[PDB]
A paper describes a structure:
In contrast to the symmetrical ePNPOqm structure, the PLP-ePNPOqm is the first ever characterized structure of the enzyme crystallized in a P61 space group, in which the dimer is asymmetric. In the PLP-ePNPOqm model, the subunit A backbone displays a major break of 49 residues (comprising residues 127–175), corresponding to the ePNPO smaller domain comprising the H3, H4, and H5 helices, whereas only a minor break of three residues is present in subunit B (residues 167–169), which could not be modelled because of the lack of information from the FO – FC map. The disorder of these elements in subunit A seems to occur as a consequence of PLP binding in a surface cleft, placed in part at the interface between subunits A and B, mainly circumscribed by three arginine residues (Arg23, Arg24, Arg215) belonging to subunit B and acting as an electrostatic “Arg cage” for PLP. The superimposition of PLP-ePNPOqm and ePNPOqm revealed important differences between the two structures, highlighting the structural change induced by PLP binding to the allosteric site. Indeed, PLP binding causes the dismantling of a specific pattern of hydrogen bonds and electrostatic interactions anchoring H5 of subunit A to a short neighboring protein segment made of residues 192 to 200 of subunit B (“H-unc”).
In Escherichia coli, PLP formation is catalyzed by pyridoxine 5’-phosphate oxidase (PNPO), a homodimeric FMN-dependent enzyme that is responsible for the last step of PLP biosynthesis and is also involved in the PLP salvage pathway.
Residue numbers in the entry:
A (entry chain AAA): 17 to 126, 176 to 218
B (entry chain BBB): 14 to 166, 170 to 218
The structure:
C-alpha cells in the first residue's frame, strides 16, 4: 500500500533502475495509466504547452512516445526540441521528471503518425516522506556519468 | 466512476464561463475519490527555453486566475520572474480528462499571502519555515534537524520566502476523452472581455 523512505544509500547507479522499480510498483498497485506522462513543450514566444502522452518505450538513449506529426506538440518540438516529461504518481506520493531534447524517431520505429525520443539530461525523483518532508534526488547527466543531488522538497 | 466518463461533450453542454465547467469537473473528481483533485502540473520555462514541470496544489480560483503557494526562492519562482508565461494541467486521466490553463503568473500581494497563510494549521505553518526549496542539500538530517528545531515556535510568523502566484486565464482547454472514441476537445480563448470558444480536433 504505502512505501517508506528514499535515502541516498538506496539509490541505484542507473536512474532508470529506480524508474523501472517505481513504474512496475505503479502497475502492481493498478493505477490508471501507469505509463501516462505530461509532456511540456515551448512555442515560439516562450509559452509552455502541456498534454498527456503514453510512454511506449524507454532505455538509456531516451523515453519514447508517439503522436501525430501534424499535432500542435509536433510543430513546437520542430521549432524547439527542449521538453519536460512528468509522471504524476501522486497517488503513491511520487513524481518523476525528465528533462531532455525530443528527437523524431526514424520511419522504421516499427503517414502522419510519428514518434519522439527525449534524451535523459536530467531525471528527478520525488517521494513523499515523514513530517510531510519529501525525498528529492536529481540525476544530472555530465561527462558520461550522473551527478546526483538531494534537493530540498 | 464511469458515471461521468460515459457521455460525450458538445458546445450545447458548455457554459459561457469556463470556470463553471472546471468547477463541475473538479467537484466530480472529489466525488469520484481521485487522489488530490486539486493537484495540477505547472510548466515553466528557464532562460534557455527549456521547460520544467512540477505538481502543485490549486488553493483558490476565480475569473482573475488560478492560485498556488510556493517557496519564492524555488526553481519555479526564479523561472517565473524571468518568464511569467506558464501552463497548468489537471491530470484527471482516471476520468479520461485533462484541463489545461494558459496565462501569466503574477506574485500574490503580501496581504493575500497573509490571509491564506493564517487559514492553515500550525503544522503546515511551521512546515513552511523548514525547507530552502529546490536548493542542494547535504542530507535529510538537515531538514529533519530544522523541522524538529522549529517546534520551539504561540503565533506562527510568516516566512518572507513563502508566498504564491496567480496565473491569469488567457486560455482554458477541456479534454473529454475515452476508450475508443475521438476526444471531445474545447478551447476557451480570452478576447476583448469575452471567451472565444472553439472545438479542436483531437
Ligand atoms: C491517458 C491519455 C493518454 C494519451 N496519450 C496520447 C499519446 O500517446 N499521443 C498523443 O498524441 N496524444 C495522447 N493523448 C491526448 C493528448 O493529451 C493531446 O490531447 C493530444 O496529443 C494533442 O496535443 P497537442 O494539440 O498539444 O499536440 C492522451 C490523453 C490521455 C488522457
Ligand atoms: C501532491 C503534491 C502537491 C504539491 N504541492 C505543492 C505546492 O502546493 N507548492 C509547492 O511549492 N510545491 C508542491 N509540491 C512539490 C513540487 O512538486 C516541487 O517538488 C517543488 O515545489 C519544487 O519545484 P521547483 O524545483 O521546480 O521549484 C507538491 C508535490 C506533490 C506530489
Ligand atoms: C468554433 C466551433 N466550435 C465547435 C464546433 C462543433 O461543436 P459541436 O460539435 O459541439 O456541436 C464547430 C463546428 O463547426 C465550430 O466551428
Amino acid at each position: 500500500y504505502t512505501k517508506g523512505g528514499l535515502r541516498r544509500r538506496d539509490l541505484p547507479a542507473d536512474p532508470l533502475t529506480l524508474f523501472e522499480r517505481w513504474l512496475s510498483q505503479a502497475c502492481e498497485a493498478k493505477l490508471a495509466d501507469p505509463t501516462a506522462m505530461v509532456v511540456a513543450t515551448v512555442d515560439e514566444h516562450g509559452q509552455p504547452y502541456q498534454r498527456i502522452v503514453l510512454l511506449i518505450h524507454y532505455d538509456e538513449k531516451g523515453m519514447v512516445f508517439y503522436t501525430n506529426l501534424g499535432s500542435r506538440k509536433a510543430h513546437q518540438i520542430e521549432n524547439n526540441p527542449r521538453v519536460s516529461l512528468l509522471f504524476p504518481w501522486h497517488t503513491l506520493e511520487r513524481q518523476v521528471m525528465v528533462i531532455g531534447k525530443a528527437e523524431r524517431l526514424s520511419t522504421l520505429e516499427v503517414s502522419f503518425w510519428g514518434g519522439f525520443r527525449v534524451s535523459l539530461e536530467q531525471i528527478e525523483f520525488w517521494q513523499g516522506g515523514e513530517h510531510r518532508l519529501a525525498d528529492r534526488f536529481l540525476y544530472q547527466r555530465e561527462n558520461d556519468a550522473w551527478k546526483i543531488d538531494r534537493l530540498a522538497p
